Design a protein around this ligand. Structure first.
Ligand SMILES: NC(=O)C1=CN([C@@H]2O[C@H](COP(=O)(O)OP(=O)(O)OC[C@H]3O[C@@H](n4cnc5c(N)ncnc54)[C@H](O)[C@@H]3O)[C@@H](O)[C@H]2O)C=CC1
Ligand SMILES: Cc1cc2nc3c(=O)[nH]c(=O)nc-3n(C[C@H](O)[C@H](O)[C@H](O)COP(=O)(O)O)c2cc1C
Ligand code: SF4
Ligand code: SF4
Ligand code: SF4
Ligand code: FES
Ligand code: FES
Ligand SMILES: [K+]
Lengths: 44, 213, 263, 430
């Protein structure tokens, strides 16, 4: 059934204050290992 | 509104702030997004995380973000005073942000600012005595075709009349959380009297794809 | 040699690659006006007083930061260079306070001198100025932050040479304040040299405060004895009494700094 | 083609612009997204850069630099440093709300654009600097990125092509100047969002010191559609050097303020009266149009009758295209109050780094605030013009230009209204 009458983007009515950060915490396992500059910080 | 700090008894480096352990795991996931050796790039998320755990930034959240990222505390003070979201004073539980730039001032955001003022009994910058509503006046929130609009803590309330923002404030005082949407008939950003475009069904995979792919 | 050929006011000069436009003008003996550029600090480019015209280029370039390309004719005295200098000086003097008599930097002020040299001779600013809260960064450096032009020589010195990382800019826009944001006291062993590099009387010497004035001082070039570095100094006297101790430049000793004990 | 506009629905890139379909992965793959992405990735960087150069895509951020020429600055050998695509999802321009609609409603199109563009520029990851105010859109985008990882579309062996590519989302924290590409780079690096000087361009020294291309959400999201549909399909719309389709945000004093995808060189009057229902009170009620968001000079009714909505015809109309954000202002508008509020915006959103913006934008706000009341004299109008000409061109980034241009447009097209405001102040207060 082709629907062009209802707004299908209803998920953001249930986002809390930690939705973005828990999504980042979930996505932390899917990611490639970060590159290294060769030092701990530019003050090292 | 000031950009120097004075130690009040409730805002000092002996004010108790510390992250929860689930927020420490969130900070680990934040710092793993940046290259090894550029940990200072995690100042802006983690400090914003300190604004989500606490509601505002004392000068112990700034020093803790400085300490766990191994950055100097002045480099966190600069980030905290540069960016307008970081509350360096305690705000109300609902932080009402009225946009009053030109695409919203042309669609009468002044009436809504007056409506929030005469409803809450406060003015711009003041917090209500129950510490539930803080009213300030912000710049373009990026919802210009849905003007006039406000932001409450994550959410955009759009296409508002003064009655609509009175009703949103009434049901925020009652404990429920409203729907972040245009309070007119439309859904997100379409023309208000029906679709002038995108009426045809979308084509799907393979349509118009060039040869040699 | 990989020296490229650039032109300053039509005059040919051979420069190393990566030479800034300011250094190319400096090789032919011409000093571009500047407030944030300091030859021993890192390049900031945030005062725009060094804007010079490259010809056949419809945009002034920041000469403190822009590397030269091959065959640029740098126009140090052209009309839009002078208009850039006058406009930038007018914005520097718009919110700047009328403190020149009560300012210790008067007579030795870069803002005064290159207002006389490169700016207009009157004001169009018909508004009220800003006033900034004074900070307390020690018993050595008097701080009058209404006189600050936000050139960030403070911050680059304290970060790169003193290794302190406690000076910074708070806020945004015209309310951007240079300070420490807290009641914090900037006491390094080199904390006095921020009085040297500050081109205005925003940071002044608190022992030298109000006592003398630079045109009446006799400059005796001498040597430090407080340590075994042998830092070359100027003892400036007035009527047979020592008024202050400034640094001399010696490239191999004290490059242009002195310690707080020497000062 | 000679007259432009009336874009067909089959020729749309941003299907599901209005939130009327499923924005998630099973909805996006049912609308043409993520189709033959591996065959786009395997044909190399040179083929994708050639398809972007063929299409004539210019920068949708607002300056309109040629996108293929900009992305071919990364087609250079590795010097040990990684390479980064960075998506500019700030969108702080008043009038402009199109990138919010792309992130909120077509997020997988942005993720596929990150993958295809970072393949073209040899990039390692995508940092989507999203606006901090767009929280629901950021979590919306993170759900789409999780769906893209779990389908294997990005990450380790992205789309089965042997190409490793990450997609990160960095939230902003409330600074319009952090949409400027170097200040956005400085904001990702954890500092104050102050713009860098150029050169070094971000392709030489960008985020973290790496080769880096910052590109808008729209100029990235339309890139898989350019790779699938062909560059000549995208170049077959709009005038020459004004190719493609464009999102438009018509707000202000129109009957139906809306976002609409439209062909590039559409007339302004046709766009307003066709997609927004026209100006409130009729077209004769039109006073002015700010054509492309706040930074562009406004144009009066006698320019809006015939003007085309691309880069070049608005440059010839002594304004700019910008973000194609049409702010319509009717005859009931105190236009000095609107422009002075816009200059007030630019002094509230100004990072304080260099002298002409930090001092002169506040000084222009004080002069404009007196011009609203008329508390001045006409010799201060020309003086204000000179102040704008001392801010324009002498600043580090183009926010000084974007603060100077509304003042210059208001003076250039409404000097008599300023003069009558000031003379009636003078005759009712003396
Ligand atoms: N979308 C939004 O929310 C906003 C958009 N804008 C738009 O931003 C525009 C100004 O943007 P800018 O980047 O400052 O202008 P433009 O001078 O710099 O440059 C545009 C792009 O071309 C690239 N580029 C140009 N010349 C280059 C060269 N020689 N080498 C390498 N790369 C080069 C730059 O890296 C940049 O990404 C304004 O015209 C305005 O329309 C302004 C404010 C907000
Ligand atoms: C003050 C200022 C703010 C800007 N804000 C944005 C922005 O929010 N989003 C955007 O895409 N471009 C913005 N730009 C334009 C960028 O400098 C840059 O040209 C663009 O983001 C990426 O290039 P592109 O147009 O080819 O995509 C801004 C420019 C300036 C001077
Ligand atoms: S810093 Fe210079 S211009 Fe300013 S008051 Fe002192 S002497 Fe005058
Ligand atoms: S106090 Fe002086 S050195 Fe420091 S930023 Fe201000 S003008 Fe520059
Ligand atoms: S002109 Fe304004 S926006 Fe740009 S670097 Fe300077 S203070 Fe920043
Ligand atoms: S102007 Fe109010 S949201 Fe952009
Ligand atoms: S000297 Fe180049 S801008 Fe300050
Ligand atoms: K000084």
């Amino acid at each position: 059934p082709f629907d062009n009458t209802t707004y299908k983007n209803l998920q953001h009515h249930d986002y809390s204050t930690y939705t973005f950060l828990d999504l980042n915490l979930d996505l932390s396992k899917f990611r490639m290992p970060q590159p290294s500059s060769g030092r701990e910080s530019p003050r090292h | 509104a000031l950009f120097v700090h004075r130690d009040t008894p409730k805002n000092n480096p002996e004010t108790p702030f510390d992250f929860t352990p689930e927020n420490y795991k969130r900070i680990e996931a934040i710092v793993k997004n940046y290259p090894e050796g550029h940990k200072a790039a995690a100042v802006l998320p983690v400090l914003d995380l300190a604004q989500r755990q606490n509601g505002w930034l004392p000068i112990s959240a700034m020093n803790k973000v400085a300490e766990i990222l191994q950055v100097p505390p002045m480099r966190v003070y600069e980030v905290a005073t540069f960016y307008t979201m970081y509350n360096r004073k305690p705000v109300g539980k609902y932080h009402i942000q009225v946009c009053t730039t030109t695409p919203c001032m042309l669609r009468n955001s002044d009436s809504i600012l007056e409506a929030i003022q005469k409803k809450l009994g406060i003015k711009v910058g003041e917090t209500t005595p129950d510490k539930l509503f803080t009213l300030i006046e912000v710049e373009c929130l990026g919802a210009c075709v849905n003007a006039p609009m406000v932001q409450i803590n994550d959410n955009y309330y759009e296409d508002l009349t003064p009655k609509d923002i009175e009703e949103i404030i009434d049901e925020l005082k009652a404990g429920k959380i409203p729907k972040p949407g245009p309070r007119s008939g439309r859904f997100s950003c379409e023309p208000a009297g029906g679709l002038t475009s995108l009426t045809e069904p979308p084509k799907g995979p393979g349509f118009g794809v060039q040869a040699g792919l | 040699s990989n020296l490229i050929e650039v032109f300053v006011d039509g005059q040919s000069v051979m420069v190393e690659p990566g030479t800034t436009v300011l250094q190319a003008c400096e090789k032919v003996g011409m000093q571009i006006p500047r407030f944030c550029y300091h030859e021993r600090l890192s390049v900031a480019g945030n005062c725009r007083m060094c804007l010079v015209e490259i010809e056949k280029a419809p945009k002034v370039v920041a000469a403190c930061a822009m590397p030269v390309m091959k065959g640029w004719n740098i126009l140090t005295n052209s009309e839009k260079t002078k208009k850039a200098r006058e406009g930038v000086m007018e914005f520097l003097l718009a919110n700047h306070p009328l403190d020149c008599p009560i300012c210790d930097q008067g007579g030795e002020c870069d803002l005064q001198d290159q207002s006389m040299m490169f700016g207009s001779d009157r004001s169009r600013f018909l508004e009220g100025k800003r006033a900034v809260e004074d900070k307390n960064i020690g018993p050595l450096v008097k701080t009058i932050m209404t006189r600050c032009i936000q050139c960030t020589r403070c911050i680059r010195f304290a970060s790169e040479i003193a290794g302190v990382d406690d000076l910074g800019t708070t806020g945004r826009g015209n309310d951007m304040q240079v300070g420490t944001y807290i009641e914090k006291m900037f006491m390094s062993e080199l904390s006095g040299n921020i009085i040297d590099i500050c081109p205005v009387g925003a940071l002044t010497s608190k022992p030298y405060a109000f006592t003398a004035r630079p045109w009446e001082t006799r400059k005796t070039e001498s040597i430090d004895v407080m340590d075994a570095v042998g830092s070359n100094i100027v003892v400036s006297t007035r009527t047979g009494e020592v008024m202050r101790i400034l640094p001399r430049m010696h490239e191999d000793i004290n490059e242009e700094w002195i310690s707080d004990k020497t000062r | 083609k000679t007259s432009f506009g009336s874009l067909k629905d089959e020729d749309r890139i941003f299907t599901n612009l209005y939130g009327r379909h499923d924005w998630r992965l099973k909805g996006a793959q049912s609308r043409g997204d993520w189709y033959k992405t591996k065959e786009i990735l395997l044909k190399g960087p040179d083929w994708i850069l050639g398809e972007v150069k063929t299409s004539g895509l210019r920068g949708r951020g607002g300056a309109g630099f040629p996108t293929g020429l900009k992305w071919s600055f990364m087609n250079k050998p590795s010097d040990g440093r990684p390479k980064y695509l960075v998506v500019n999802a700030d969108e702080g321009e008043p009038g402009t709300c199109k990138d919010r609609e792309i992130i909120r409603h077509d997020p997988h199109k942005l993720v596929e654009g990150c993958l295809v563009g970072g393949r073209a520029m040899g990039a390692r990851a995508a940092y989507i600097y999203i606006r901090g105010e767009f929280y629901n859109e950021a979590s919306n985008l993170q759900v789409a990125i999780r769906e893209a990882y779990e389908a294997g579309l990005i990450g380790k062996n992205a789309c089965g092509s042997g190409y490793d590519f990450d997609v990160f989302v960095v939230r902003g924290a409330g600074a319009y100047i952090c949409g400027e590409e170097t200040a956005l780079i400085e904001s990702i690096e954890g500092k104050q969002g102050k713009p860098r000087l150029k050169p070094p361009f971000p392709a030489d020294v960008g985020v973290f010191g790496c080769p880096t291309t910052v590109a808008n959400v729209e100029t990235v999201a339309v890139s898989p559609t350019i790779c699938r549909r062909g560059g000549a399909w995208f170049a077959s719309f709009g005038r020459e050097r004004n190719s493609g389709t464009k999102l438009f945000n018509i707000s202000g004093h129109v009957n139906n303020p809306c976002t609409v995808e439209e062909e590039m060189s559409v007339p302004l009057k046709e766009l307003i009266e066709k997609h927004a229902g026209g100006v409130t009170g009729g077209w004769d009620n039109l006073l002015a149009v700010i054509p492309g968001g706040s930074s562009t000079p406004l144009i009066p009714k006698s320019v809006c009758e015939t003007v085309l909505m691309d880069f070049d015809a608005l440059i010839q109309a002594q304004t700019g295209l910008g973000t194609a954000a049409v702010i319509v202002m009717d005859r009931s508008t105190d236009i000095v109050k609107a422009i002075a509020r816009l200059i007030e915006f630019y002094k509230h959103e100004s990072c304080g780094q260099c002298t002409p913006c930090r001092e002169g934008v506040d000084w222009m706000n004080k002069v404009m605030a007196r011009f609203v009341r008329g508390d001045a004299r006409p010799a201060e109008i020309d003086s204000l013009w000179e102040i704008s000409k001392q801010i324009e061109g002498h600043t580090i980034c183009a926010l000084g230009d974007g603060a100077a241009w509304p003042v210059q447009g208001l003076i250039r097209h409404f000097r008599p209204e300023l003069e009558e405001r000031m003379q009636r102040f003078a005759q009712q207060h003396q």
